[PDB]
């Protein structure tokens, strides 16, 4: 029902080996649709979903111009942040920016976000109201003062509440077959002895979309959170996702254990049993 559009930007310095590497990707929900890579030959924003290919030359020229301007600002940022933190040229550093907007089932704006990180830690982010900033440390207060004096939040709010939402709706319509689907998980559990007295129980969810899902184990109805190994949801490569959860249990106790799967494509949450 609910949807999101997000753009992700990463710039990495490589001291003594040229200009920083810059990569940008855009997603609608869990489906990537565009990319730009500074090291690639084309120097264009490029399509990565079939439904965005129909956008005309004005779109690709405009997105390429904007993504290059993003690349140039993040390039400058790497130098600026080295100054703010009194760092040398001995090492590589990373800047990340992500922004975008969420809508509900009725495609009306829920909230917007714009967040920046330096060396893998929060640096500065727009607050939920889109009118003020959260700065994580003293160096980010400097950026906050500069961005308040330049009225950055007013410009971002306008984009996030207006333009971002309008284009998300356009993409949801044009890419409806891909984007407005739900593929319910195909589920099962597997059982393998690890010794003569213990077995691994693994609960599987395959071929689902969107990626959000919950898998949990219970023993006599009690959650087994601390004893569960839960892997990161992973792409199958075809537009759907996979995930599993496992527990190691004493042999003979299998019937006490149940796996529980929740996903938006299921009419009801599933309970899988060994009896």
């Amino acid at each position: 029902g609910s949807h999101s559009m997000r753009y992700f930007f990463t710039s990495v310095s490589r001291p003594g080996r040229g200009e920083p590497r810059f990569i940008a990707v855009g997603y609608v929900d869990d489906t990537q649709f565009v990319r730009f890579d500074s090291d690639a030959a084309s120097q264009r924003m490029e399509p990565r979903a079939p439904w965005i290919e129909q956008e005309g030359p004005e779109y690709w020229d405009g997105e390429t111009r904007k993504v290059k301007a993003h690349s140039q600002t993040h390039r400058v940022d790497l130098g600026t942040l080295r100054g703010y933190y009194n760092q040398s040229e001995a090492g590589s550093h990373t800047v990340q920016r992500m922004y975008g907007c969420d809508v509900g089932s009725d495609w009306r704006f829920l909230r917007g976000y714009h967040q920046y990180a330096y060396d893998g830690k929060d640096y500065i982010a727009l607050k939920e109201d889109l009118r003020s900033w959260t700065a994580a440390d003293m160096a980010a207060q400097t950026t906050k003062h500069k961005w308040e004096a330049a009225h950055v939040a007013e410009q971002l709010r306008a984009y996030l509440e207006g333009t971002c939402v309008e284009w998300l709706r356009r993409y949801l319509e044009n890419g409806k077959e891909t984007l407005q689907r739900t593929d319910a998980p195909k589920t099962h559990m597997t059982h393998h002895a690890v010794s003569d007295h213990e077995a691994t129980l693994r609960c599987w969810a395959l071929s689902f979309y969107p990626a959000e899902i919950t898998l949990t184990w219970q023993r006599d109805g009690e959650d087994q959170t601390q004893d569960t190994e839960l892997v990161e949801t992973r792409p199958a490569g075809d537009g759907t996702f996979q995930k599993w959860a496992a527990v190691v249990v004493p042999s003979g106790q299998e019937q006490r254990y149940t796996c529980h799967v929740q996903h938006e494509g299921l009419p009801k949450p599933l309970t899988l049993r060994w009896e």
Binding site: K66, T73, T80, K146, V152, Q155, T163, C164
Partner: peptide, 9 residues
């Protein structure tokens, strides 16, 4: 992408 509001830190 945003065409405004993306500034240097």
């Amino acid at each position: 992408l945003a065409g405004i509001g993306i500034l240097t830190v």
